[PDB]
Design an enzyme around this catalytic site. Sequence first.
Site, PDB file in Angstrom:
ATOM      1  N   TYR A 127       7.029  -2.149  -9.536  1.00  0.00           N
ATOM      2  CA  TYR A 127       6.997  -1.300  -8.661  1.00  0.00           C
ATOM      3  C   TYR A 127       8.342  -0.245  -8.087  1.00  0.00           C
ATOM      4  O   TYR A 127       9.937  -1.597  -7.919  1.00  0.00           O
ATOM      5  CB  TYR A 127       7.081  -2.135  -7.399  1.00  0.00           C
ATOM      6  CG  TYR A 127       5.278  -2.936  -7.037  1.00  0.00           C
ATOM      7  CD1 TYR A 127       5.380  -3.904  -8.255  1.00  0.00           C
ATOM      8  CD2 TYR A 127       4.419  -2.538  -6.464  1.00  0.00           C
ATOM      9  CE1 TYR A 127       3.558  -4.975  -8.219  1.00  0.00           C
ATOM     10  CE2 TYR A 127       3.180  -3.125  -6.507  1.00  0.00           C
ATOM     11  CZ  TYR A 127       2.792  -3.859  -7.593  1.00  0.00           C
ATOM     12  OH  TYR A 127       1.982  -4.356  -7.126  1.00  0.00           O
ATOM     13  N   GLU A 171      -3.582 -12.563  -2.493  1.00  0.00           N
ATOM     14  CA  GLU A 171      -3.458 -11.587  -3.408  1.00  0.00           C
ATOM     15  C   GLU A 171      -4.850 -11.592  -3.983  1.00  0.00           C
ATOM     16  O   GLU A 171      -5.689 -12.441  -3.204  1.00  0.00           O
ATOM     17  CB  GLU A 171      -3.451 -12.919  -4.681  1.00  0.00           C
ATOM     18  CG  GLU A 171      -1.776 -12.396  -5.200  1.00  0.00           C
ATOM     19  CD  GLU A 171      -0.501 -11.546  -4.536  1.00  0.00           C
ATOM     20  OE1 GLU A 171      -1.167 -11.032  -5.227  1.00  0.00           O
ATOM     21  OE2 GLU A 171      -0.069 -10.892  -3.505  1.00  0.00           O
ATOM     22  N   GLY A 225      -2.582  -5.600 -13.604  1.00  0.00           N
ATOM     23  CA  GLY A 225      -1.608  -6.266 -12.120  1.00  0.00           C
ATOM     24  C   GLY A 225      -2.390  -7.186 -11.541  1.00  0.00           C
ATOM     25  O   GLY A 225      -1.386  -7.811 -11.561  1.00  0.00           O
ATOM     26  N   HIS A 274      -1.734  -8.701   3.018  1.00  0.00           N
ATOM     27  CA  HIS A 274      -2.908  -9.672   1.620  1.00  0.00           C
ATOM     28  C   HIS A 274      -2.374 -10.582   1.437  1.00  0.00           C
ATOM     29  O   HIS A 274      -1.195 -11.643   1.485  1.00  0.00           O
ATOM     30  CB  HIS A 274      -2.860  -8.182   0.914  1.00  0.00           C
ATOM     31  CG  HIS A 274      -1.406  -8.509   0.471  1.00  0.00           C
ATOM     32  ND1 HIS A 274      -0.432  -8.500   0.606  1.00  0.00           N
ATOM     33  CD2 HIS A 274      -1.009  -8.548  -0.835  1.00  0.00           C
ATOM     34  CE1 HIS A 274       0.483  -8.011  -0.486  1.00  0.00           C
ATOM     35  NE2 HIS A 274      -0.199  -8.724  -1.706  1.00  0.00           N
ATOM     36  N   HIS A 291       0.681 -12.420   3.370  1.00  0.00           N
ATOM     37  CA  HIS A 291       2.393 -11.893   3.283  1.00  0.00           C
ATOM     38  C   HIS A 291       2.596 -10.119   3.212  1.00  0.00           C
ATOM     39  O   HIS A 291       1.537  -9.388   2.773  1.00  0.00           O
ATOM     40  CB  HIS A 291       2.990 -12.175   1.689  1.00  0.00           C
ATOM     41  CG  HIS A 291       2.901 -11.722   0.979  1.00  0.00           C
ATOM     42  ND1 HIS A 291       1.721 -12.441  -0.039  1.00  0.00           N
ATOM     43  CD2 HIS A 291       2.378 -11.039  -0.744  1.00  0.00           C
ATOM     44  CE1 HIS A 291       0.714 -12.061  -1.319  1.00  0.00           C
ATOM     45  NE2 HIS A 291       1.699 -11.404  -1.172  1.00  0.00           N
ATOM     46  N   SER A 328       5.848  -7.837 -10.990  1.00  0.00           N
ATOM     47  CA  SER A 328       4.928  -9.092 -10.794  1.00  0.00           C
ATOM     48  C   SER A 328       3.489  -9.362 -11.547  1.00  0.00           C
ATOM     49  O   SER A 328       3.501  -7.702 -12.015  1.00  0.00           O
ATOM     50  CB  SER A 328       4.761  -8.551  -9.569  1.00  0.00           C
ATOM     51  OG  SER A 328       3.582  -7.560  -9.589  1.00  0.00           O
TER      52      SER A 328
HETATM   53  N1  LIG Z   1      -1.377  -4.030  -4.327  1.00  0.00           N
HETATM   54  C1  LIG Z   1      -0.620  -4.813  -4.101  1.00  0.00           C
HETATM   55  C2  LIG Z   1      -1.645  -6.021  -4.693  1.00  0.00           C
HETATM   56  C3  LIG Z   1      -1.182  -7.136  -4.678  1.00  0.00           C
HETATM   57  C4  LIG Z   1      -0.132  -7.256  -4.559  1.00  0.00           C
HETATM   58  O1  LIG Z   1       0.234  -8.572  -4.819  1.00  0.00           O
HETATM   59  C5  LIG Z   1       0.633  -6.399  -3.556  1.00  0.00           C
HETATM   60  C6  LIG Z   1       2.355  -6.908  -3.291  1.00  0.00           C
HETATM   61  C7  LIG Z   1       3.005  -6.317  -3.716  1.00  0.00           C
HETATM   62  C8  LIG Z   1       4.238  -6.656  -3.195  1.00  0.00           C
HETATM   63  C9  LIG Z   1       5.340  -5.435  -4.112  1.00  0.00           C
HETATM   64  O2  LIG Z   1       5.334  -4.213  -2.974  1.00  0.00           O
HETATM   65  O3  LIG Z   1       6.966  -5.771  -4.378  1.00  0.00           O
HETATM   66  C10 LIG Z   1       4.762  -7.575  -2.965  1.00  0.00           C
HETATM   67  C11 LIG Z   1       3.961  -7.938  -2.806  1.00  0.00           C
HETATM   68  N2  LIG Z   1       2.363  -7.920  -2.677  1.00  0.00           N
HETATM   69  C12 LIG Z   1       1.207  -5.029  -3.696  1.00  0.00           C
HETATM   70 CL   LIG Z   2       1.061  -7.258  -8.291  1.00  0.00          CL
HETATM   71 MN   LIG Z   3       0.681  -9.574  -2.885  1.00  0.00          MN
END
Ligand SMILES: Nc1ccc(O)c(-c2cc(C(=O)O)ccn2)c1
Ligand SMILES: [Cl-]
Ligand SMILES: [Mn+2]
Length: 351
Positions: free
Chosen positions: A175, A188, A168, A186, A274, A286
């Site tokens: 997703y 990144e 990831g 969070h 975000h 992503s």
């Molecule tokens: N668990 C996690 C780790 C890093 C990330 O960057 C995200 C994340 C996920 C989404 C999503 O669920 O589409 C959107 C933004 N950040 C989630």
């Molecule tokens: Cl990601």
């Molecule tokens: Mn994110």
Amino acid sequence: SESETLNPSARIMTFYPTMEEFRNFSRYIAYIESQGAHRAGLAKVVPPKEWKPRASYDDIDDLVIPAPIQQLVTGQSGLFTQYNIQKKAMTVREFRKIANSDKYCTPRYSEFEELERKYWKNLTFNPPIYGADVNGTLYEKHVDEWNIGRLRTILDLVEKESGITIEGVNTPYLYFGMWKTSFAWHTEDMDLYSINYLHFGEPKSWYSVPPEHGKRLERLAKGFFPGSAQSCEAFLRHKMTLISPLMLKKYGIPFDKVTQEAGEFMITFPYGYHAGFNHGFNCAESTNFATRRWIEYGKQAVLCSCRKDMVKISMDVFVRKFQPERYKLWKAGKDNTVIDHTLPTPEAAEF
Ligand SMILES: Nc1ccc(O)c(-c2cc(C(=O)O)ccn2)c1
Ligand SMILES: [Cl-]
Ligand SMILES: [Mn+2]
Ligand SMILES: [Cl-]
Ligand SMILES: [Mn+2]
Ligand SMILES: [Zn+2]
């Protein structure tokens, strides 16, 4: 002051690149940063209408979601903690069926503000299933523009040097969302960039806090969750913490919001906090990426200190290659460089 005069409000910006601008990924990132997009922590990029990463999404019904998670949320007054419960593996077909079923489908509404209010009102009820962290890509192997599977940024130096893959992070994730599935507040891992492409389905809505204001959010969060703050130096990295926009307004944390449509890219910038939710059945892809500007963020990122197998990237190869004059000082722990969140990545000197 040159950079601080660009996007002084730190609002989320939206870009419409031509096909010529769209082909060079790292170059266009440098460009939008020259326009001050990074100050928001989040930006939308709408690709050329003729560009498509995949001819058709009709074959993926049998794609397996190995670890779907049921999102239980507990809390009140705009403050919530999300607990993941892993469910048995299931196919996209099985997932979409559940997603569109009467029990889990999108409620009806007029304007977006209504759906948003319903999200924050019903967040703790009828826990949804999120088909999250699926290893893979939906890009056709020939698509050379903005291919999440191969963006060719300097983040590639991690694998190239160590052989290490981090799922990831320097590999792609899929997703599959349904209504009311969430991603907590969070930044990144290692405070990297991220890229997010909504392949198909209902929209994904985002909240963002400017990096120059990220510390204030952290102080607020620590106040709201003192137990968690004491147990970990970076508990937001657990990605379990949900905070409503009303709560941010109440405590003067600046933020912006944006809704992502199918076929649209979202870019998150280093130390850009975000969070958000999916409107209904959709699918997003992503991964993370880097620019030379990220390196200092990476060197100074405050990491999770309680969880094992948390993502820690060795910054050594980056400092040696792109900051050779600082390498010795940095190894000796005497590098006291202070980050200016307004400055654009040096690759944008062409602009
Ligand atoms: N668990 C996690 C780790 C890093 C990330 O960057 C995200 C994340 C996920 C989404 C999503 O669920 O589409 C959107 C933004 N950040 C989630
Ligand atoms: Cl990601
Ligand atoms: Mn994110
Ligand atoms: Cl934190
Ligand atoms: Mn607590
Ligand atoms: Zn932790």
